[PDB]
Design a protein around this nucleic acid. Sequence first.
RNA 1: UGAGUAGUGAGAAA
RNA 2: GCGAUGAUCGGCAGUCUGACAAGU
Lengths: 238, 121, 403, 168
Amino acid sequence: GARGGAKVVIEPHRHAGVYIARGKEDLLVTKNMAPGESVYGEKRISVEEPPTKVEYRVWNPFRSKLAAGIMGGLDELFIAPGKKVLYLGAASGTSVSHVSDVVGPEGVVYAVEFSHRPGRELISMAKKRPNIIPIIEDARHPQKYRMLIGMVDCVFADVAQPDQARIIALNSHMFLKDQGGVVISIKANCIDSTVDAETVFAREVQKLREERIKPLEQLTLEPYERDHCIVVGRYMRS
Amino acid sequence: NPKAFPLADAALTQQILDVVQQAANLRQLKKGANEATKTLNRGISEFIIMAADCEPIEILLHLPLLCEDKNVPYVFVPSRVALGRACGVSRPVIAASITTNDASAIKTQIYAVKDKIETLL
Amino acid sequence: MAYVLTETSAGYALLKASDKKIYKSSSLIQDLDSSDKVLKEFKIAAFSKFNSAANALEEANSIIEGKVSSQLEKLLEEIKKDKKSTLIVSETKLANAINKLGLNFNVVSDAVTLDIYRAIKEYLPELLPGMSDNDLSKMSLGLAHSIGRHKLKFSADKVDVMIIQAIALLDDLDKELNTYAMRCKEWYGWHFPELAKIVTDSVAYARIILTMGIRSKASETDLSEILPEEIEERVKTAAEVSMGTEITQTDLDNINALAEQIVEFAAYREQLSNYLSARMKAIAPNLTQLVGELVGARLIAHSGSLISLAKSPASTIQILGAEKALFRALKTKHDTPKYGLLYHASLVGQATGKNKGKIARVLAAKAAVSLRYDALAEDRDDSGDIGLESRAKVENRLSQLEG
Amino acid sequence: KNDNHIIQAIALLDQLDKDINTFAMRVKEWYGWHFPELAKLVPDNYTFAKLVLFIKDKASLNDDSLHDLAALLNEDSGIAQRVIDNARISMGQDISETDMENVCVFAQRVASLADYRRQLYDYLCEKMHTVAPNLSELIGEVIGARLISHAGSLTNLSKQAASTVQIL
RNA sequence: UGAGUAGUGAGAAA
RNA sequence: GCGAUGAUCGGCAGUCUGACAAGU
């Protein structure tokens, strides 16, 4: 359907830094910060604009949790051009590259990872993207990389860990600004598979409230993924 | 064998091998590391079974990297000779892949194992 | 007095807080919202900058381990003159480490200090004159990579992306040295056209021009080291009965410069060949044993990386370099290829007839087994042993299949 | 009267110019990993190889070395100060001594051909003045040589009519 | 196991 | 203070198959 040279019409999305490609089929796309290559083999779209050849990257929702969040219709995203983003659980550039695309050259992305083998792949991709500062360190102890990270307008955590709530608290307390962004990708099975999904999500919201983060909206990620939801909140230190 | 991780216990291994024999009878089983590698590429694998006692174990270590990227559950069984016999072949099998089929007659049993492997991961 | 130890990718910064118990105030957020008040509240005491990346990383590791570095110790000693002072520290472990030094500082690491370390981190570019935010990120990015390599056990001798370049360098040099050789043969052919037929080697062709510049010089010059006896005498006889015309010394000088270039490319081309082979014997020793260095390089280069090739099935490795023939056959309902890029491997050459196809399948499978070892083995011994028995198995298959 | 030397010079000079570009780009890639930013700082490829030859290791940064590399090219662009600062602060992963040995030797090759290319270019200009002083003076040594090669020989060019020369 | 390396030619300016 | 030494007019394009084979 969506072959490489099929000609499509690109329009902006409601959210700044996100684009939509029309045609027989619908695609979510982000401007390529590093044109002429694909981070993970994703389809790319060529546009001739006055004539300069700008390039766009297709965002696959089945691979990126955040993109599937776009299709479900998230009302507010703190990730936008010219904003500093702390990305936790940066296994590789599958999603970080697209997050790097949205923030653009002016913005920066602090990619945090623990596992070494995904880490080196993340390093190889940050070379193509100067705005990405890869941090191969445990998110459970933010003070290890505190020298390396300045302040961030939004914090994104896709970490699939049972104690992710503690990690989001410590990182948000350290590097997130007042009224800052907090967006979480929650998997029920990793936290507690014994109980049903809705029970898992509700308790995580309770932890978020205890740590001075107010939920703004919640969205399940079906049909793309099962038993997953994204929680959007704002951090009031007051 | 530290590298083979997470490794199934005795009760789990019997349950898995019960799946592999059934899928083999129903033609829902892909045998061999290379064929298992293909199934991940097409995204048609319910889950992959590897043998922990393979020497050198690395020859199947590519599949865990493939499985984690594609979010496909995986598990190690202690014995490869057992896996080959469960597969229904005369040769030892180090890796096997269960093909996705929501219209299969053994669909329920496969998902029961898949959930347990997901818990085990 | 209250002191704040702030750590940055550039260096260590010590801040004097006017309030001895600034960390005991509940309104720190409002008292530190803007840059101007932060500058008033905190004044730099001493700033120890990292001179080099190696120093910065040794400093960074000490921070991660909670150890007080020598630079930090010297920087703290400068403030030792202030009796009965408080040192606000971001980490408890570093606070404990600084306490053990016996310095005259009541070291405090409290949750309330996090706001002080928080508000400071909003405005670091403005607090620190002389360093821009873009520059600070560059220290951040660079120090992270340098720290990253050591944690990952990155080793300079195990990067395959040398191999992808070097093989692609080698092909280009092979093309280019040919074209220049053609030009030298044509241009020098004007002064002596008979040389190309006699000596066919381009490098030997250039060396002759260097040893003898003009045909008259041929009578006395010796071409023994370049040419054997029978060849060197024929060029001499050609020189006197030649067709080429006389050339000026100005013409001679530049054609010699080419001949100097021609011989030089061959020298480096051999060097790159030896450099490449050493690279393969460290990054993929097993494949070099089985398939070889040159063919192994083209396989890795075709996929673009060692991991990418490692994840491919043996079937694709068999026909990796025959896409045009493969897809032409697939569309036209005709037989598909069976050798691919592996055709030039030694084992394929030893096979004959239809056995070539069988060995290609067997060799490709064993190549995958060896390949997955080179790519995914954390503690691989640089011996190529898995290649050795893998080679042995195919040789036995070749012997029985041929027999 | 021989003018074939000019034709060889033009057919060779462009070959070097394309070829110098080809190798020089590769030098940028190899040294680019060890510290990429100089590939951005000095866009001129011919200049880049010399600075890599002098600045092999980014760690080696001295005020006297700053003056030495400042002498290379001019400090008007300010790259001399930028490289010292930016070398101190960069993400370029150090490559092995054998890798570094290749870069300088590989860079040394790019210097030689461009050096010879300059030498050959001078010889063309000297030769054109000798053979075709009128043509070389009227338009230039490089342009006149290209016209001669297009015609196939100076005798051919004189034979052609004015309109034919214009479309040549 | 199977399986392809041909510009025109005297006007122009006033 | 004119002119024959020249006026004028990315696509094709999709990365093969998978348990038998060889001997008396």
